[PDB]
Ligand binder design. Structure first.
Ligand SMILES: Nc1nc(O)c(CCCc2ccc(C(=O)O)cc2)c(=O)[nH]1
Length: 257
C-alpha cells in the first residue's frame, strides 16, 4: 500500500500540525537530491507506480474521515476517498490517467470529474478566488466534512471546490513552503480564520518558476530576478536562492544536476 499520514482537526495544535506537515514532507521525498540546500521531489520520468503517491488521512472531531491522494513528484492533490466512493480530477494526460488507476483500488465507486484540479478551474466552480476563501482549522474541519458528504448528494459543487482549495493550501502548499506552513500555524495558534494575503498567493503561483530558477541558478544567483509580493500587495525582486532557504521547502524536479 501507499504511505499514509494522518491528521485530525479535533484538538489540533501548532505542534500536531507541524508534526503532520513534517511527516508529509518526509514521505513526499527521501531528500537525497538537494540543490543549493533545497530538497527536490522525485523525477516523473523514471518513477514507478508503487512509489508515486502518498495518502493523507484527514479526520474531524465529528469523527468522519477522508483520504487525499498526493502526487509525489509535485505534492499535487489528484483525488480523494470518502467511504465507498473515490473521486479524481480530470488528468492532464494518459500517463497520469493510467497512474491514478492504482489508487483506492478497493472502493466500490470510482469517478473522474469533467474538470481538472488547477486553482483557476476550482475558483470558477467555487465562485470565489483564493483571496476570499478563509483558511484555518475551522475551514479545514468544514472542508473535510464537505468532502465526506459529497457522495451522498449533501454537498453542492461550489462548496466542494471551496473545500478542495482549502485542503490544497493547508497541505500541499504548506508542505511546499515553510512560509505557508507558518501561516497556517499562526491561525491554528490564535484560533483564527482568514483568507491568504498576497505573499501567500504569489508564492503559490510562482512555485514552478522558483523551482526552475533555483535549479538553473549560478551557485544560487538567479539568471534573472523573480518578482514576488509582500503582505500588503507590493512587488519586490528576489535575486538569489539564499533569501528563500527559510521560505521554500521542496521543488519540482526540473532537470539533472
Ligand atoms: N489540485 C491541486 N493541487 C495542487 O497541489 C495545486 C498547487 C498549485 C501550484 C501548481 C504548480 C504546477 C502545477 C502543474 O502544472 O502540475 C500544478 C499546481 C493546484 O493548483 N491544484
Amino acid at each position: 500500500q501507499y504511505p499514509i499520514i494522518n491528521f485530525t482537526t479535533a484538538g489540533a495544535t501548532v505542534q500536531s500540525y507541524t508534526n503532520f506537515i513534517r511527516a508529509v514532507r518526509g514521505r513526499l521525498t527521501t531528500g537525497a537530491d538537494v540543490r543549493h540546500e533545497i530538497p527536490v521531489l522525485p523525477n516523473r520520468v523514471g518513477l514507478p507506480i508503487n512509489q508515486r503517491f502518498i495518502l493523507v488521512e484527514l479526520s474531524n472531531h465529528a469523527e468522519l474521515s477522508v483520504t487525499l491522494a498526493l502526487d509525489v513528484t509535485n505534492a499535487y492533490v489528484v483525488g480523494y476517498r470518502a467511504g465507498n466512493s473515490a473521486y479524481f480530477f480530470h488528468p492532464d494526460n494518459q500517463e497520469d490517467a493510467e497512474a491514478i488507476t492504482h489508487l483506492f483500488t478497493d472502493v466500490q465507486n470510482r469517478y473522474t470529474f469533467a474538470f481538472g484540479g488547477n486553482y483557476d478551474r476550482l475558483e470558477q466552480l467555487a465562485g470565489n478566488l483564493r483571496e476570499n476563501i478563509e483558511l484555518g482549522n475551522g475551514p479545514l474541519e468544514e472542508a473535510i466534512s464537505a468532502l465526506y458528504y459529497y457522495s451522498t448528494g449533501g454537498t453542492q459543487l461550489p462548496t466542494l471546490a471551496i473545500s478542495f482549495i482549502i485542503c490544497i493550501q493547508m497541505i500541499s502548499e504548506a508542505a511546499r513552503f515553510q512560509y505557508i506552513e507558518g501561516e497556517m500555524r499562526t491561525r491554528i495558534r490564535y484560533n483564527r480564520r482568514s483568507a491568504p494575503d498576497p505573499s501567500v498567493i504569489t508564492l503559490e503561483n510562482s512555485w514552478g518558476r522558483l523551482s526552475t530558477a533555483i535549479q538553473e541558478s549560478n551557485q544560487g544567483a538567479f539568471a534573472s530576478p523573480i518578482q514576488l509580493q509582500r503582505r500588503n500587495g507590493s512587488k519586490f525582486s528576489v535575486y538569489d536562492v539564499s533569501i528563500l532557504i527559510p521560505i521554500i521547502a521542496l521543488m519540482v524536479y526540473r532537470c539533472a544536476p
